[model samples]
Target: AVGACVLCNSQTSLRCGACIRRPFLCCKCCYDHVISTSHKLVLSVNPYVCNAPGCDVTDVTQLYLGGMSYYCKSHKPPISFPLCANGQVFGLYKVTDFNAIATCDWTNAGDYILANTCTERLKLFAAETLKATEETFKLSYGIATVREVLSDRELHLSWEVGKPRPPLNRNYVFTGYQIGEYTFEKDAVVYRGTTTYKLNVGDYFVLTSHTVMPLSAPTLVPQEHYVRITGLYPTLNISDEFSSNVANYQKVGMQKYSTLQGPPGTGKSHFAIGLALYYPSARIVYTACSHAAVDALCEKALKYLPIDKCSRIIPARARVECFDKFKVNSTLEQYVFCTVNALPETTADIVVFDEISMATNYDLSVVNARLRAKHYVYIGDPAQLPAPRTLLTKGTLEPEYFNSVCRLMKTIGPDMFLGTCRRCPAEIVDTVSALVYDNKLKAHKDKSAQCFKMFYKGVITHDVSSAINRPQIGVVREFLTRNPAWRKAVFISPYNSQNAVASKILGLPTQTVDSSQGSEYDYVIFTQTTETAHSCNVNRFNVAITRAKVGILCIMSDRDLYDKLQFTSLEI
Candidate 1:
């Protein structure tokens, strides 16, 4: 123990325990103690070292980025990380001869790192166990390699770190590196020519192709701007003045106070596209909760505006036919499409946020900073799927809300609510509107001759024992087997296991109701394996049923529960 200072309250270095009887004094305080002692340097309250194995570092805070790891001076390549079974995999940098750079490394085979922290440092063990043998993830982050390119082998290639930064991640910080450039290299061949491309690496690889780079840090800085937005509330508002017409909002310019709420097929997508065109030199930020939704709207914007005036900022979704097969980056395009999850840093004259009902108050804030949009419009079907349940601290949010649309929408006047489901006929849109929208929603499509068909379970017998109901699975396969027009049909479920089971069986994939939000299917073959109404989760049911643009075959398990759902027993 460095002895205590005889003077100042600050810590001082004094070797004798007796001298430090009053307190552990730093050397500086003891300096007065020694004219009482001379003093110079020190470390902070808690001691930490750099994560680099063969390096020297004292102040962990002095490191570059902030997160769990603390590397000393950002170690250069030719390094090996401590091996453990906590899924610790990284280092995409390629060096000649594997023997040269790898100094000593081992893989963490465990699914989770056993974490323990108290006094001096934070420790993460290499296993998801306490010998108690269970996964306990209090707070954690993953390091992995991801890529969307699969099945198409030529598109999939190994990634090695090393390059300079060209584009930026706009303003936000998220997990993983913001991706760097790859030079055009060849095997004794320059061949015919070369091509260049770009995309939001997080969107590109995070889904299926996140190539590893432990150096990739979690960018948390976006939270600051996000915080201010939760309180601002576009229009500071949810139910401002509902308008199918966006023309007036564009004219008033800054502080365009309005919201547009609608159920499925409400022509809301087209409404947004037209909103941007009405503006003169419209610097628009068109965004949604999912990348798929953003791209869908962007594609429409592309159709309306000049090809040069619009931009699709993130990597296009797989399986969807996207225009500009090689389009990826954002340029001087007036209309830019992106997701609320990962925002670009450009300012906007008009901000259009779609499917906002699914985003928490915090997620919507990206519109404030990244947008700084003068004319901000909130558009979504609050009735379809309210934001997911969230853990909110007291007094942190205004109106004590999680989703601005779901929470504050009621406070606004009724005439201000936007309503219409253009995607479906009046009969097809019946259940959703009746159950959720106070039956006020109208169908734009004329039902002159059957434009839709809904086939529900004819006689529900009993509740399924598991999420994957065998009988329902059979029904789905049978329906698809008989109806060739359902060639593009999508199977949907509320449970992940149920989705995978049907997906595996049908040799086709299924999406959870949450995943189906924003993307529509020609036919939605949904199997709610659980009892029809365990109170029948309204939001899940709303999103699932509305995905059916042409037809929907809902298969439920329990007869008693189906009646309990106010179904009076489906006659399908």
Candidate 2:
């Protein structure tokens, strides 16, 4: 062979201006060098076919490479490199340089290619390129976006406007309204009875449910929103408390001390709490004799009064978090746990002692002396339970040597006495009233009160030995299953031993008169373990029967003992 080409040493097929400058270059080298620079390639002997994938073009003249593809004069280069061929479609960019992606009916059809024409590929691509290039619609508060396009002239969009009062839910109709002008001609009622307005795209409007009234605009007078208050007491569930005799005792002003007496379920707690809320400006310190009592008041106070206005003093032994939200301090001045010491220094306007029946005479005197307040209020039911007896009694006492709350009642003379039985059913109410108020201990009702029909048998009598009756217990279980609301009811016994046995028999905890005091249930089942009436105290009987809100059942050991009690009126 002759000496190699100057550029490649292999035989050359074509040469260009680069090869002319340095002759003897191969055709591939000359073409590559011309493609890199601005040199025209020259080939005369052989011609190549078009180098597009799937394209068949022969007799190619004036071949040039553009974007790694050889093009001829007859065959144009692709507008889209990877053209959406037979079965494919595109949305963001044009499929061809000349054709716009739309319906065959040119008038209503816009940027989207119709799925009807394209049979092999049934697909829809959104107008992303057009929407992205132009400014998309937006509202001031909420989001406004193009849902979809129905036709070339119409756009379906959704808008959610924020905060005038009740929020508006609206769907947009594009009628070429001015940008700042209201689009909806009038208010429209949508599905589910919600009223929506056709608001301007960028304007704000106040929407409300209440009627608006216009007044004369004369001169603007500056005024204060808040003035000095006398007192603030918000009453919750004022159904009977406001109408009853106890309402007379709830005086609105400060005093040396006042006493309120009522049996359990008499709304004593609610009455006291209402008084505290009534006087919002008063710096009141509410304390109870027992931790349970104090904690219960704290829970009610937190819900009934504002946080800053209500403060609770719980017993030192109680958990700090027992009364949440209300301020709680464990000092003796605010809280009295088994004993009392020096009262904490306070500028309290009023000091209220609840469940004072459980406080000793000495303890009451100590708290009274230490409480430097403009007024004092003591709340409790003396008949429920007395304070823990101590050898040292150190307060002014009645001739009968009264208990703490009783002693206070004698000195303060009971500013209010709540006698209404709002919590008990008619059967239980009449029975309790006859026993405590009418001084009748027999198992009968002397007077009557309006009450709901006993859902189940109100008085379920069961004969049992001084022991638990298995059949009666099973019946009770069946009854409770039939009426699930009675599950909140309790089984009460005169003796703790009987309570333990009844608890085991019914597979539920049993409550006693003292334990069930200041608490209530939906129903009450009094399981009598005591054989004689001598064992039952009138106060304890009254307390037990009145605990039920709906119904009461007496499970007796002796029918003769039960007959001693009388039921007076039941004509209804």
Candidate 3:
């Protein structure tokens, strides 16, 4: 399971304890030449015992591997050693003194602590000026208390007041998910969207210009991080039974970046659940553009995902009773569910962006900048919707960062596509497929349901140029009133004027077609009031018509008014 040995090229369970690469070793003989002599710690099959002659401390398995004996803390190198208590290294050498405890202050540069700079960086402790003086400067807060010089650079030190914390990171290598500031100022929530005037409250962090500081993004233990010391990092054992898309990703028959494109009802969510289970040891981060999509995926993941293994990163200050159902009690989970904006700044085995076509370059950057992902799975239909422009005022499709998936596709194309859709009737699927996907959304017409898949004809348009078409609202309200079942249905409109009017009449809060990207309804009523609005935009039209599972009622100013809302035939 530990793969082949790096030196002898044989099999072994032993590995170097200090090295970040964690090269496999057959035994101690290989540790000297293959591994640096200074890199002392090594994990072996049996417990490590003290080599201090009669010191047979078998209970202590803290150090040693092969035949070498690493003396325990009690049995040191035959002499007392110095401890740098309250030792804080800043970028520049400075001084801060406590009478009882010695404290060293210097700027904490993120530079690697190699031998060349190790002496230069640690020289502050050996400075002739033993006293804290005005000549030295103090900038950073918190001082480290080193236990012992475990190594020249990777010293183990930790603590703060009475706060119980995770085990301290033994290395100062700055493997990077360092502390980054997400400041909430003069506002009630963490605002991450563009400078659009429309305000949609989702996540909250209500405080008066309050900025919270984190020590560093969460990290896993280096020894057990890359590969298990014994466990096999298995291959994709998909049954190929009827062939399934690896929802969260493609097998590395795929990529560090895999783009999976598909149409409606292709079981993207179903596949994600399986991957979360398949890669049980993987720290997976499932994200999407909307909370509904992310929440829905988590809900299904929980159906099979072991309890407490997965948790949802509920949007900051987001109040949802939905969290009560999950096996999470406000804790960090191994498989995390979150939006791209609310992403946990932690290392991940797979970062699955669900609705990837809607993911902007900035959205991808936000994820890459904070969390380190071994595999990035981008899944979404470019034919459905595109990433929102960074600056709506400029009307730029992409200043630099376009839809993350589309940009990747220009180079790699799509590795996988969940082509067949089961959500709609063959008629509906074929109709939308013809209009947008170049007939690529292969139809499972045999499985098509017997449901209402028709368009309505509107007569009046009080406002030909404006979005507030009065007759469209009247027809939509009347259509909803026909069945009290309409209360469960959703109304998707492209214009604010149309939504404000139609939603009030129907007593249902309506959203634009774009807003309903990741949502669905048992029955849907999509209203387009503007005569020329979205006239030639098939992507917007595709999203508008695809949100229904059973029935859809398309209401426009008139069927002849615009191509956006006009439904046509596809079957020969």
TM-score of each: 0.52, 0.45, 0.53
User: Considering summed lDDT, which 10 consecutive residues are worst modelled in model 2?
Assistant: 212-221
In Å, residue 321's CA in model 3 sits off its true spot by 6.8
Clashes of 3: 7
* Comparison by lDDT, 2 against 3, better one: 3
lDDT of 3 by residue, 75-138 (tens): 6554522111122101011111111011222121111111012222122211211112112211
lDDT of each: 0.46, 0.44, 0.49
When sorted by lDDT, best at the front, the candidate numbers are 3, 1, 2
lDDT of 1 by residue, 178-279 (tens): 443222111021111112233222332221132211111110112121212221212312122234454334333433445666577776777777665555
Please tell me which predicted candidate would have the highest lDDT against the true structure. 3
RMSD of candidate 3 to the truth, in angstroms, is: 20.4
TM-score of 2: 0.45
Query: What are the RMSD figures for all models against the true structure?
Result: 16.5, 33.8, 20.4
Model 3 weakest 10-residue run by lDDT: 91-100
lDDT of 1: 0.46
